[PDB]
Design a protein around this nucleic acid. Structure first.
Lengths: 218, 193
RNA sequence: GCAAAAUAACAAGC
């Protein structure tokens, strides 16, 4: 399988790190009716790998779109011609846009591959967070590994790729605090090894739309 | 579970680290023959951060140890050795040397992940050897979290492979023994951190 | 936290 994607970066602009929620917020407030940028579907939410993601990476904004359905949004709504980025009531001019668009392999590979989180991973949901907090170091390492596999099966599913080989992972990760919904939920930083091919700047999930869990290749 | 031990150190003198080959022969040469130069070693020669080190462990090993340089020190005491419920973190002060000829081949052809879960087993292997030889039964399952990196080591002036890093295990390891192969000459020295 | 019965290794949406 190949995965088609559009990258839109706003290099001249630079924002504080982990401001993605603000960035993703504005884009979704302005393009209120699209429903692919922000994920409430009328009254309900939508549960699926978000194929429009917003990140801040190396202090610059990065807008990601994935496959026919996400790229159509970017192209049709002309996100690369965007006027201004209003982040915390102060507007930023958009004087430079840099967009790679291409496809890459997605799914299990022969060679093991080494990745690194470019933003906090945020692997633990509610039920897992209790497990983690109550689990000693080694048990945690194993736990996180499994959940990492988990994330890979969620994204792979939503993207309609069914993995026919077994996944093995090596994780080297340190803890990091990340505030979300005025709450302290934990998230990790680090690098990891997996036999899966993971297109650059994609997130492995929890709250992927705001940039959390963004992996890049090393 | 208490395991008695004796450390003898030479504070001032300094030299090359992993030098071993240029000072490895004396201890045997001058008194030959007493200790096995020709079971887990209860007499261990180390160089820890530029300074020499000697370790007796257990009654047998202490008694032997009864035997310019200027000042010299001895911390001498008995420590806890065995399994524990509280996870403990250790770091190698000398290259591990965990693979033998056979296991080096398996390691040589392996992807980084299986390489990890290969080392994990080996480590638990070593611990069990030591535990056994020193006459301790291990009544709970050992688990490990290991972060290590390859490093080149010269031994008998061939080049084998060894590992520098840190690791987590529910065993309680006294300071400065073990655990790799060739531990009498100072390899794989673990210290609590 | 609110949500969530979703082909998986039980993983995901605001």
């Amino acid at each position: 399988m190949d995965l088609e994607y559009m990258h839109i970066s706003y290099p001249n602009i630079l924002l504080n790190m982990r401001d993605g929620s603000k960035l993703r917020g504005y884009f979704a407030k302005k393009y209120i009716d699209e429903e692919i940028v922000h994920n409430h579907r009328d009254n309900a939410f939508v549960y699926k790998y978000p194929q429009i993601q917003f990140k801040i990476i190396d202090r610059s904004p990065l807008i990601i779109g994935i496959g026919s359905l996400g790229i159509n949004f970017l192209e049709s709504k002309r996100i690369f011609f965007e006027k201004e980025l209003i982040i915390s009531n102060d507007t930023n001019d958009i004087t430079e846009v840099n967009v790679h668009k291409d496809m890459d392999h997605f799914g299990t590979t022969d060679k093991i591959l080494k990745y690194q989180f470019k933003t906090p991973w945020m692997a633990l949901n509610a039920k897992n967070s209790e497990i983690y907090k109550n689990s000693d170091e080694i048990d945690r390492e194993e736990f996180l590994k499994r959940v990492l596999i988990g994330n890979i099966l969620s994204m792979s599913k939503s993207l309609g790729y069914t993995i026919e080989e077994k996944l093995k992972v090596k994780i080297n990760l340190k803890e990091v605090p990340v505030k979300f919904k005025n709450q302290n939920m934990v998230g990790f930083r680090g690098e990891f090894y997996i036999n899966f091919d993971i297109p650059q700047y994609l997130g492995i999930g929890r709250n992927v739309s705001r940039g959390f869990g963004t992996v890049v290749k090393v």
